[PDB]
Write a protein that binds this ligand. Structure first.
Ligand code: FAD
Ligand code: FAD
Ligand code: 6R4
Ligand code: 6R4
Ligand code: TZD
Ligand code: TZD
Ligand code: TZD
Ligand code: K
Ligand code: MG
Ligand code: MG
Ligand code: MG
Lengths: 582, 582, 287
């Protein structure tokens, strides 16, 4: 039974109604940057003893933190911003959450209702702007609609295929006195009627039939399996089917496991892409057949019967047409199939040992590899050392680029929601704020931001947030003084012609610029720099052992190329296994 | 006669066509951050020997720099971004340019045409997102449309009421070989038919008639007069009518001049607001009657015949209904009236000396003022010292907040386009990037960013840009360890109840956090901190005399309130003249 | 009710629009493409493996034939009054099922779909998704222009017919051999039917005649045709119906036959909106 700070017959500001509405949703943390149109809400937050605000230094840092909070917990991330420039600063975060299907509730303050449309002070039509980059949005036009809309916003953001929901609240609504009704019904008749039914036995039995008739099955696992860790593991035990994950599905199945084919796709392992290429049965669970994964669609799993289980019916048949499909929760589908696979285990002598052996040969002949040049630090090796010293139990947020791929390749995530990374949009400056949200959601966990020097500096101001909030965020900065991935594409497609990809100072080429150690020192965060590979292990150990925030500046050669690589729109036969920028 | 780097019959990439299109517009500088969807464009830029790229460390820094470039020169600002996260990072800048009517051309890369709408890698529907926050936007669907669209984009951005125009260019279009036609006609028949005619003598004579029949005339000057400095000055000489400017119109008429009433509005001078309040003739030239200026509309210039000259017909009669209006260029209107006022000078014995004397009494009894507490540095005084040491000839960019108002109040701008500030949207983090664009456009000028500690840290990463580009940008940081303006509103409307407005470290309250000196040192930028008022003059002098970039950290008391203040939606009788947070 | 529709069946869906596959019901097997090409591909397989696949659904077909025997399409004949179902059945016989049929929307639309056996596609022209009244007569015009040598008949209701009655002028001017079989019940039939079953037969603006002269047929559709120089006639007795339709067909050029029908007729059988097969209604009218 919920307890309000107000009497049931006592009028109160809309802002106080809005905050209590969040309290009734179980919200414990918000990421809010104060402004004129949202001052009432901020005043109401201070009256709440259950909701804590983490003040960012930029709204983009705020919304990215809410994403990290959401991705690392499964809870919806909540960020609050003011009108105008505050609201527009959320846009990259909203788009990011929509593409990666992250549950997010964003509340923006707005000018008074009568002032809307008059080009008023700090006014943007944020609902118009964000309509195409959110799952849904609202413009509250009356104080009595606040309880209903907030409830609908959280329901829409967390149910079905998760996504961002924005609620725009005019300032006069926040100031109006009213008595809220919490027993009101949601106005979502269309959405609720299209909510997927629990998976029928008819479809589940069809899948099990295909499994027993296959000889080269492959699991194609993605972000939709992040809540099905136990069920997926049980499924693999009963079938023995090897598992290949997407960038978004890392950790759903243990990467260090014997049946793990690791990541597939453009920068996936050779044996993972091989498995899909030669499979006769593709079990696509919680994926959306992205172009980074498939390449040329007609060549992707061309010899396989495709099974697709997605909670979004619009995804089923979008890029590739499945022979068998299930529209519903993959968690429930796995549970249903596990019961059948267990009761008919003796009847179904499932043994794909020959197929698994064939893949093990590919894993032996084409493993993930890297070179060690003298005493220079291989970024791949640095991440591998972090894995060992954290025992693969750390929460890892990254930026976007070469370091992002290496963090996905050379760290073996044992559980889901350890891996926090911008996949669909691929937004730089995501790593540091996401680590903040993750550390807030997981106070006792080891949180490490594996970042690049280009992505790190984009939201470097959030270092202030980290110190003020006393968050034990570790920053493993892989510094190559360049925009790595773009530089890599320059080497292969533009004859290594440099077009604004150097991030240092041309006046002092060999000097590391900027000095990231001084950024950390500015915010009272202890830092160090390692250059020699021999000193790397002790340096990372120091970063972990030192209580509180820490920045380790790891200097890396910029000639490194991410391998292997399947060219955009290419096939498995177009895979590149050797080459760099030397 | 323009000279191309290609033969008239030689096929070339769309990216090369796009860059030459910019060259034919006289573009010398762009602000571009490279990404996959815009790599072709960046490759094409390196082949250009006339166009220089300033690489920012964040796209928001890039677009804000393009604004500073535009505001300080009158030329269109050009920024280029990649698809997805790059494009969404421009949004705050686009909205900012639209509200302040700043000429801006933003070019974004886009995924291949066939890939659009499929939730592809790094894809955002940027045209949908930015439709309501740009003057116009385009999606190029064929390489042959590039010359026409680019020409239209620059025409729309710079003609009539200036504004931002976004052009989205799919990657396959950039790669396609074609022979461009530069002799093609623009498809803007509606827009060009609605372009205001040159002002008729009929309307101009009506205004002159009103002037000769008035006894208390006041000039209400805004951003529309930024190109009419000479004409406005001539007008004032012939009439003797006192001048009151908006936040956007500072410098159009010399602030240090005898007939200058300085700024009016919410934080305008008492005598400026008094003049408008008791005027019988209000000459509204290049303004839009914003709520920051008028307050309660029915009380604004209630006893005055209102003359409104605006190039946007949609602005004439929007908030207040004018008795006399002219839809056209205020520059041309001034020229027409000056000829009449000169030829009929003896006939029209214009003398508003009695009215001017009445205002001089108000200027004597209610001047701009501030207190000096011990050795603590008054921010108002710091800005006043900067004025003296730069002889009022410096280019000033600011953030948003208390320091923004003091920079507008206590610096006397002698010419237009010295004052660069976000007025309509009021976006924080604008100051530093805008100074960058201004310094690029004006290499020999004194560029100073008067910033607050909250606004400064938002785009602090652009310090790297400043050092790399070797720009003589001076940073006058007014550090009060708080969000000043919000804190001020807390004191007056919420019983000084603090709601996340402290920017320092609560663990070390008296320690200045963060250490901004170390941010500058990280980017190799010389810096210093002044705390005692006695040492302030020498410190600012050092900042100016030291060649290259410089950061001066000025410590200020956070108890200061911006005065005078007319409450939002209030009248002149509601003006507040005394009070702070002590 | 979707959950009850083909609940015991494995569903195969072949559609050229991928957005349709899985929209309402989730298929076990699907093909996104031209059904014409899919049929061609399957026919080759079904022919080459005919001996291997001893396909025989004779038992299932026999089970359905029993249902076809016990629950066939039916109608009553009251005295000499003309059953609309019968009128359409006579048209079928006299045109040998080779005529192009356009209709309006309502009861007559359903009877035209039930009691005429179309032998080829594109004989049946009717507004299905939107169900727009006033469609019949103009559609017949377009059909007659596209098919100059065909027998084009507009089976219309008095409500739908009058909505675009002005196109009678078009028919005469263009000299199109459009036949109009007007089923006149003086009411909006289908709405009237729903009134009888869901609103206790409470009439809410469903009568199309003149309340001052209830038993007089209003309006006089014969005079609409005469206004546009189109030969017309009216039949009331069922005995005279066969000769009347024959006259309509044999008379060269446009023709309007005004068939007077009892308004108490209900379209059967009927499954209520959002209902299941067990909710099917087989008997009842408005008498
Ligand atoms: C620089 C860079 C390189 C990249 N290269 C690669 C690469 O090499 N390999 C790679 O895989 N990715 C790569 N990506 C990431 C890629 O762009 C996509 O983010 C990713 O491939 C798509 O993830 P997904 O297919 O698992 O589906 P997601 O984006 O994670 O979406 C989840 C899907 O499952 C469904 N779903 C959600 N919940 C449920 C549920 N409970 N039950 C059933 N279904 C559910 C959803 O409807 C959705 O369709 C890269 C990204 C970047 C920035
Ligand atoms: C914290 C803060 C406090 C503020 N307080 C104040 C304040 O106290 N006082 C104040 O004045 N502002 C204040 N503002 C700024 C305010 O919000 C607006 O930006 C400003 O008042 C509007 O400027 P403007 O009226 O001159 O018109 P602008 O926004 O500058 O637009 C120019 C107008 O002139 C027209 N125009 C353009 N070119 C021409 C031409 N060639 N010929 C004719 N017409 C043309 C345009 O159509 C347009 O209508 C504040 C902003 C902030 C962030
Ligand atoms: C220098 C003064 C600017 O500072 C502020 N102005 N301000 C307000 O002006 N608040 S307000 O309700 O009356 C308002 C009125 C009209 C248009 C917009 C607003 C608005 O909500 O802007 C945030 C407001 O809330 N703050 C903090
Ligand atoms: C780790 C690989 C990601 O790096 C890159 N991918 N990439 C591309 O993939 N370029 S691309 O034309 O073929 C493309 C194809 C499909 C969808 C989107 C795009 C696109 O333009 O994204 C920028 C591209 O241009 N870069 C730099
Ligand atoms: C905001 C933004 N801008 C541009 C890009 C495009 N982009 C860019 C510019 C990358 C380089 C990132 O540089 P980094 O130093 O942070 O990391 P790496 O050196 O490991 O690549 S990665 C990539 O795809 C992006 N994803 N997001
Ligand atoms: C991006 C953004 N967020 C919030 C606001 C709202 N806002 C905020 C938070 C201000 C305080 C600025 O703090 P500062 O330290 O930079 O400057 P002052 O201390 O002089 O006010 S000013 C103001 O109106 C804004 N204008 N822009
Ligand atoms: C233009 C329009 N209005 C209303 C309807 C709704 N409606 C109406 C009013 C029908 C009655 C049609 O009357 P009718 O005389 O033409 O045919 P029947 O008597 O055989 O029903 S059928 C039906 O569903 C419609 N389909 N189209
Ligand atoms: K930043
Ligand atoms: Mg790098
Ligand atoms: Mg401050
Ligand atoms: Mg009828």
């Amino acid at each position: 039974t919920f307890i309000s700070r107000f009497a049931p017959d006592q009028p109160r500001k809309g802002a106080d109604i809005l905050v209590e509405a969040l309290e009734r949703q179980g919200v414990e943390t918000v990421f809010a940057y104060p402004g004129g149109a949202s001052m009432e809400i901020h005043q109401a937050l201070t009256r709440s003893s259950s909701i804590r605000n983490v003040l960012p230094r930029h709204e983009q840092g705020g919304v990215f933190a809410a994403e990290g909070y959401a991705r690392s917990s499964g809870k919806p991330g909540i960020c609050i911003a003011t009108s105008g420039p505050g609201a527009t600063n959320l846009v990259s975060g909203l788009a990011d959450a929509l593409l990666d299907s992250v549950p997010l509730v964003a509340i923006t303050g707005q000018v008074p209702r009568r002032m809307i449309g008059t080009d008023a002070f700090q006014e943007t039509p944020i609902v118009e702007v964000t309509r195409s980059i959110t799952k849904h949005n609202y413009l509250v036009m009356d104080v009595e609609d606040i309880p209903r809309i907030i409830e609908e916003a959280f329901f829409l953001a967390t149910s079905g295929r998760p996504g961002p929901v924005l609620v725009d609240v005019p300032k006069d609504i926040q100031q109006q006195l009213a008595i809220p009704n919490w027993e009101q019904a949601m106005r979502l008749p269309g959405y609720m009627s299209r909510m997927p039914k629990p998976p029928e036995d008819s479809h589940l039995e069809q899948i099990v039939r295909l499994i027993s008739e296959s000889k080269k099955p492959v699991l194609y696992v993605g972000g939709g399996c992040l809540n099905s860790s136990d069920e997926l593991g049980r499924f693999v035990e009963l079938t023995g089917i090897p598992v290949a994950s997407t960038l978004m599905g890392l950790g759903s199945y243990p990467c260090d496991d014997e049946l793990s084919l690791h990541m597939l796709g453009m920068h996936g392992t050779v044996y993972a892409n091989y498995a899909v290429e030669h499979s006769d049965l593709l079990l696509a669970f919680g994926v959306r057949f992205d172009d980074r994964v498939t390449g040329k669609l007609e060549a992707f799993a061309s010899r396989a019967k495709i099974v697709h289980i997605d909670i979004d019916s619009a995804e089923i048949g979008k890029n590739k047409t499945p022979h068998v499909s299930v529209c519903g929760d993959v968690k429930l589908a796995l549970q249903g199939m596990n019961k059948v696979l267990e009761n008919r285990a003796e009847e179904l002598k499932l043994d794909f040992g020959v197929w698994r052996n064939e893949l093990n040969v590919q894993k032996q002949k084409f493993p993930l590899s890297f070179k060690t040049f003298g005493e220079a630090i291989p970024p791949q090796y640095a991440i591998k050392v972090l894995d060992e010293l954290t025992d693969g139990k750390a929460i890892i947020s990254t930026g976007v680029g070469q370091h992002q791929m290496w963090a996905a390749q050379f760290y073996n995530y044992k559980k889901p929601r350890q891996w926090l990374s911008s996949g669909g949009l691929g937004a730089m400056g995501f790593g540091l704020p996401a680590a903040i949200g993750a550390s807030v959601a997981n106070p006792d966990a080891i949180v490490v931001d594996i970042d690049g020097d280009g992505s790190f500096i984009m939201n470097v101001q959030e270092l202030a947030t980290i110190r003020v909030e006393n968050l034990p965020v570790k920053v493993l900065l892989l510094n190559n003084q360049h925009l790595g991935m773009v530089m890599q594409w320059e080497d292969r497609f533009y004859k290594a012609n440099r077009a604004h990809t150097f991030l240092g100072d041309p006046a002092q080429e060999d000097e590391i610029f900027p000095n990231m150690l001084l950024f950390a020192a500015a915010c009272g965060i202890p830092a160090a720099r390692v250059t020699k590979k021999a000193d790397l292990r002790e340096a990372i150990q120091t970063m972990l052992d030192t209580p509180g925030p820490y920045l380790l500046d790891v200097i890396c050669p910029h000639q490194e190329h991410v391998l292997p690589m399947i060219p955009s729109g290419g096939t498995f036969n177009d895979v590149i296994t050797e080459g760099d920028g030397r």
